[PDB]
């Protein structure tokens, strides 16, 4: 009947009211987003004389505590990027209001999946894909600095926002499921399409899981479609295998969940358990259309999409999709790659 003295709905969300004044400071304009965490409103900060986005977390302990983790990591990150040059969303401040934790951010636009929808799911250009890749690798370089050692753990197009819908600048959002290297706790992490092999296999993980996700995201940004669109974990692993082959034996031999997906033969080698293309026969070369006009053949006769350009992009992506987290390309080297030599 009554939720939070009438301030909340039955979903634990604050009932947003256009034009409401909070704390003699914020005038709420409109709802501009929402998700599992709660809501995002556009509000005018009368004290700083600027528009802000306020992420209003649900009035429910599990959501509150997820956002408290997020606040701590944002404060740590922001503290070491006062010029806001490393592509992480800027948290201005936070407060508790009517039993909701509220995170005040810079205003941003919509996400890279919304951008893909805007392309009619045909993909952005290789030149725009490169700009997103360069910013993302710079962000991952910053997260890898020892004082941070932050693993985002949920990179996907939906967690990368445009600053402005007509420009290429981005910020990464949603650190609610993130952790630090010294303090890994979760076994179940990453959204499925973007989930690394080491997580699927139940193995130890580190910051390299985010580079795996990035490789997946960048292919999808150019083709319009997820690279590995599994319906469940077994399907996810099988779709990875179609492109990249059976994982190395030295990895499977140490994987707690190897036998969820694979079986070990008398000769010591591994094969899939028994609808899929044979291992490694769904070539990234063809998914990208390296020699055949890009995805769908649609980049034939366009500038900025040469065979040479595509071969550099393919090479970088295959390094991001190394099965071995020890040898998978790291942010510093990703940034030195020939794909960014223009
Ligand atoms: O802060 C975020 O996790 C965040 N997640 C969102 C999820 C769905 C949608 I729909 C919008 C989101 C979002 N939008 C934001 C803006 Br605009 C500025 C700063 C942070 C965020 C943020």
DSSP label of 67? H
Give the tokens for residue 159.
């967690």
Kindly report the protein residue whose alpha carbon is nearest to atom 5 of ligand 1.
Answer: 174
Q: Check the CA dihedral 210-213-218-221 and report its sign.
A: negative
Give the tokens for residue 7.
């301030």
Give the tokens for residue 21.
């004044």
User: Which run of H or E residues covers position 57?
Assistant: strand 50-57
Q: Per CATH, is 82-88+108-342 categorized as 1.10.510.10?
A: yes
Measured in angstroms, how far is the CA atom of residue 171 from the centroid of ligand 1?
10
Could you give the CA distance from residue 122 to residue 199 in angstroms, rounded to a whole number?
30
20-52 CB burial, b ≥16 within 10 A, e <16:
eeeeeebebeeebbeeebbbbbbbbbeeeeeeb
Kindly report the protein residue whose alpha carbon is nearest to atom 10 of ligand 1.
Answer: 33
Could you give the CA distance from residue 165 to residue 151 in angstroms, rounded to a whole number?
27
CB 43 within 8 A of CB 55: no
Between the alpha carbon of residue 146 and those of residues 15, 47, 114, 119, 149, the distances in Å are: 41, 36, 33, 38, 5
CB 262 within 8 A of CB 252: yes
Residue 27: strand, helix, or coil: strand
Give the tokens for residue 70.
């997020």
In which residue are the tokens 């390309």 written? Answer: 329
Could you give the CA distance from residue 111 to residue 129 in angstroms, rounded to a whole number?
14
105 lines ligand 1 (CB under 6 A): yes
33 lines ligand 1 (CB under 6 A): yes
User: Which run of H or E residues covers position 162?
Assistant: strand 160-162
Could you give the CA distance from residue 224 to residue 119 in angstroms, rounded to a whole number?
8
In the chain, what are the helix, strand and coil shares in percent, each to the nearest 5? 35, 20, 45
216: Cβ contacts below 8 Å, ≥ 6 apart: 193, 194, 226, 227, 228, 321
Residues of the chain with CATH 1.10.510.10: 82-88+108-342
Total residue length of the chain: 342
Residue 102: strand, helix, or coil: strand
CB 138 within 8 A of CB 144: no
> Which of 29, 89, 157, 173 to probe ligand 1 with, by most ligand atoms within 8 A of CB?
173
In which residue are the tokens 């990591």 written? Answer: 73
Could you give the CA distance from residue 330 to residue 319 in angstroms, rounded to a whole number?
9
Could you give the CA distance from residue 131 to residue 134 in angstroms, rounded to a whole number?
5
CB 108 within 8 A of CB 163: yes
Residue 271: strand, helix, or coil: strand
Could you give the CA distance from residue 210 to residue 188 in angstroms, rounded to a whole number?
14
CA-nearest of 36, 81, 324 to 196 is 324
Give the tokens for residue 23.
């704390």
179: Cβ contacts below 8 Å, ≥ 6 apart: 150, 151, 153, 185, 186
174 lines ligand 1 (CB under 6 A): yes
Measured in angstroms, how far is the CA atom of residue 56 from the centroid of ligand 1?
10
Residues of the chain with CATH 3.30.200.20: 1-81+89-107
The structure was resolved experimentally with: X-ray
CB 201 within 8 A of CB 166: no
Could you give the CA distance from residue 223 to residue 216 in angstroms, rounded to a whole number?
11
175 lines ligand 1 (CB under 6 A): no
Measured in angstroms, how far is the CA atom of residue 26 from the centroid of ligand 1?
18
Supply the residues annotated as catalytic. 154
In which residue are the tokens 């987290």 written? Answer: 325
76 conformational bin, left if phi > 0, alpha if psi -120 to 50, beta if neither? alpha
Measured in angstroms, how far is the CA atom of residue 102 from the centroid of ligand 1?
12
Task: List the beta bridge partners of residue 45.
Answer: 26, 50
Hey, which CATH number is domain 1-81+89-107, 1.20.1090.10, 3.30.1360.120, 3.20.20.70, 3.30.200.20?
3.30.200.20
Could you give the CA distance from residue 190 to residue 139 in angstroms, rounded to a whole number?
18
C-alpha torsion angle, residues 90, 58, 162, 74 (rounded to 10): 20
Backbone angles phi, psi at 311, to 5 degrees: -65, -40
Residue 303: strand, helix, or coil: coil
Kindly report the protein residue whose alpha carbon is nearest to atom 17 of ligand 1.
Answer: 108
Residue 146: strand, helix, or coil: coil
């Amino acid at each position: 009947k009554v939720y939070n003295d009438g301030y909340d709905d039955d979903n634990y969300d604050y009932i947003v009211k256009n034009g409401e004044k909070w704390m003699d400071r914020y005038e709420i304009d409109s709802l501009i987003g929402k998700g599992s965490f709660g809501q995002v409103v556009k509000a005018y900060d009368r004290v700083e004389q600027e528009w802000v986005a306020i992420k209003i977390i649900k009035n429910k302990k599990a959501f509150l505590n997820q956002a408290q983790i997020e606040v701590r990591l944002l404060e740590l990150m922001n503290k070491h990027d006062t010029e806001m040059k490393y592509y992480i969303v800027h948290l201005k401040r936070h407060f508790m209001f009517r039993n909701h934790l509220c995170l005040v951010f810079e205003m941003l636009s919509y996400n890279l999946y919304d951008l893909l929808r805007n392309t009619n799911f045909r993909g952005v250009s290789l030149n725009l894909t490169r700009k997103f890749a360069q910013q993302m690798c710079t962000a991952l370089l910053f997260l890898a600095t020892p004082e941070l050692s932050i693993i985002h753990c949920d990179l996907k197009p939906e967690n990368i926002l445009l600053c402005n819908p007509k420009r290429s600048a981005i910020k990464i959002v949603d650190f609610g499921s993130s952790c630090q290297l010294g303090q890994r706790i979760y076994q179940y992490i990453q959204s499925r399409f973007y989930r690394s092999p080491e997580v699927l296999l139940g193995m130890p993980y580190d910051l390299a899981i985010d580079m795996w996700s990035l490789g997946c995201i960048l292919v999808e940004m150019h083709t319009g479609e997820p690279l590995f669109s599994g319906a469940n974990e077994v399907d996810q692993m099988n779709k990875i295998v179609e492109v990249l082959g059976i994982p190395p034996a030295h990895i499977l031999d140490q994987a707690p969940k190897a036998r969820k997906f694979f079986e070990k033969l008398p000769d010591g080698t591994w094969n899939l358990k028994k609808e899929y293309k044979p291992p490694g026969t769904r070539k990234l070369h063809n998914i990208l259309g390296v020699e055949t006009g890009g995805p769908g053949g649609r980049r034939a006769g366009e500038s900025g999409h040469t065979v040479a350009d595509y071969l550099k992009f393919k090479d970088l992506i295959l390094r991001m999709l190394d099965y071995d987290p020890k040898t998978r390309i790291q942010p510093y080297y990703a940034l030195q790659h020939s794909f960014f030599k223009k």
